[PDB]
Amino acid sequence: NSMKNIESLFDYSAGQFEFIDHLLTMGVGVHFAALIFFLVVSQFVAPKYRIATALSCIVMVSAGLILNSQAVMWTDAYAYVDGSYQLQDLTFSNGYRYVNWMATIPCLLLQLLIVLNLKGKELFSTATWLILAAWGMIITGYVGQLYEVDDIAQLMIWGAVSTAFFVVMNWIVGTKIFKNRATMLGGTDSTITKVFWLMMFAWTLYPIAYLVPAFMNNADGVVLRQLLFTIADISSKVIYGLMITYIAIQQSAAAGYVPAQQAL
Numbered sequence: 001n002s003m004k005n006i007e008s009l010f011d012y013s014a015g016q017f018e019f020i021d022h023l024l025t026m027g028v029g030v031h032f033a034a035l036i037f038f039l040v041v042s043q044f045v046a047p048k049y050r051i052a053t054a055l056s057c058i059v060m061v062s063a064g065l066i067l068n069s070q071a072v073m074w075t076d077a078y079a080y081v082d083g084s085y086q087l088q089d090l091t092f093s094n095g096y097r098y099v100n101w102m103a104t105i106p107c108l109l110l111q112l113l114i115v116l117n118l119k120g121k122e123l124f125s126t127a128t129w130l131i132l133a134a135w136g137m138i139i140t141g142y143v144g145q146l147y148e149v150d151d152i153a154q155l156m157i158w159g160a161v162s163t164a165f166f167v168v169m170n171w172i173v174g175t176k177i178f179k180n181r182a183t184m185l186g187g188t189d190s191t192i193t194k195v196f197w198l199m200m201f202a203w204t205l206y207p208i209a210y211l212v213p214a215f216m217n218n219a220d221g222v223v224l225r226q227l228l229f230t231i232a233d234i235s236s237k238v239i240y241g242l243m244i245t246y247i248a249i250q251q252s253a254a255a256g257y258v259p260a261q262q263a264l
């Protein structure tokens with residue numbers, strides 16, 4: 001799929017190449033640093049909500065491994081020749097980001113439903129529909145970006161089908177949050193509403209990066225998309241995880257879990 005993405009179309013100045021490489025490496029570092037944080041604070045989370053913080057560890061490592069894979073594919077595919085980085089081997093594509101989403105998006109969705117205090121029948125059915133919608137969004141998007149060079153019209157059609165799933169997923173997420181925030185302890189009924197708007201903002205950056213080929217088909221666009229991915233990843237995975245943990249700890253403390261009370 002490397003020859004299908006716009007990355008394969010351009011030579012890169014040293015500055016452009018090193019910046020992209022440094023974004024990807026910086027990203028590996030932020031995720032594995034947060035992995036340790038989530039690992040260590042899980043002992044301060046009541047059993048009720050401990051899976052939520054554990055799911056963040058899974059998200060961090062999954063995202064960190066992909067970003068680490070990308071950084072090495074990026075340096076494997078290009079060589080500095082005659083004053084610019086030129087494609088040598090067909091080994092880089094964003095398609096692996098989409099495979100990190102198939103597995104990480106369910107994890108991110110499930111930790112939200114856990115701290116909303118859903119359980120039993122409703123948790124199982126709500127997650128199934130959220131995961132089906134999210135996989136439909138991702139799959140249709142993955143097919144679309146296969147055409148970001150050869151057929152932009154087709155990228156837009158698949159993007160619109162993907163956006164329909166996205167809208168429906170957000171309608172479910174939003175409805176559940178607003179119908180269940182009253183059950184939330186420790187005043188986290190107020191915090192959960194900020195998480196909803198963080199998700200809305202951070203998750204909507206991905207379709208924007210998706211569209212870069214249509215409005216900035218050049219080497220600066222490749223840099224820009226990677227920049228947006230980096231901001232979207234840190235906000236949708238790292239910051240979102242920090243807030244889910246804070247909600248887990250706070251509710252734990254309000255529920256009589258002493259380590260949480262000790263920690264907070």
Ligand SMILES: CCCCCCCC/C=C\CCCCCCCC(=O)OC[C@H](O)CO
Pocket residue numbers: 160161163164166167168170171173174175178179
């Ligand atoms: C592909 C082109 C078609 C694009 C179509 C754009 C439609 C925009 C509308 C909603 C977007 C989804 C945003 C969902 C916002 C939260 C919804 C919500 O919270 O629902 C409240 C509930 O009804 C009470 O509790």
Ligand SMILES: *C\C=C(C)/C=C/C=C(C)/C=C/C1=C(C)CCCC1(C)C
Pocket residue numbers: 101104105108137138141142159162163166203204206207210233236237
């Ligand atoms: C790493 C975590 C998350 C939640 C990544 C989320 C990505 C999306 C919601 C992507 C959405 C897309 C849409 C709405 C339409 C264009 C294709 C995309 C897959 C980029």
Ligand SMILES: CCCCCCCC/C=C\CCCCCCCC(=O)O
Pocket residue numbers: 047048049050051110123124127128131132
């Ligand atoms: C075909 C796609 C189907 C997707 C179904 C998978 C979704 C399952 C949802 C919730 C599983 C329950 C996870 C356990 C909750 C934590 C238990 C605990 O806190 O002790």
Ligand SMILES: CCCCCCCC/C=C\CCCCCCCC(=O)O
Pocket residue numbers: 132135136139140143
């Ligand atoms: C790896 C498990 C993936 C699960 C697949 C089932 C998810 C159902 C979600 C929506 C299906 C959308 C079907 C689009 C197929 C056309 C794309 C193509 O031609 O390859």
Ligand SMILES: CCCCCCCC/C=C\CCCCCCCC(=O)O
Pocket residue numbers: 152153156157159160163207210211
């Ligand atoms: C990711 C969000 C999806 C956005 C869907 C956009 C809806 C369609 C908008 C206008 C379609 C115009 C198609 C013109 C492309 C002609 C092909 C070409 O010459 O490049």
Ligand SMILES: [Cl-]
Pocket residue numbers: 038052053054055056111241242244245
């Ligand atoms: Cl978490």
Ligand SMILES: [Cl-]
Pocket residue numbers: 094145209210
């Ligand atoms: Cl993409």
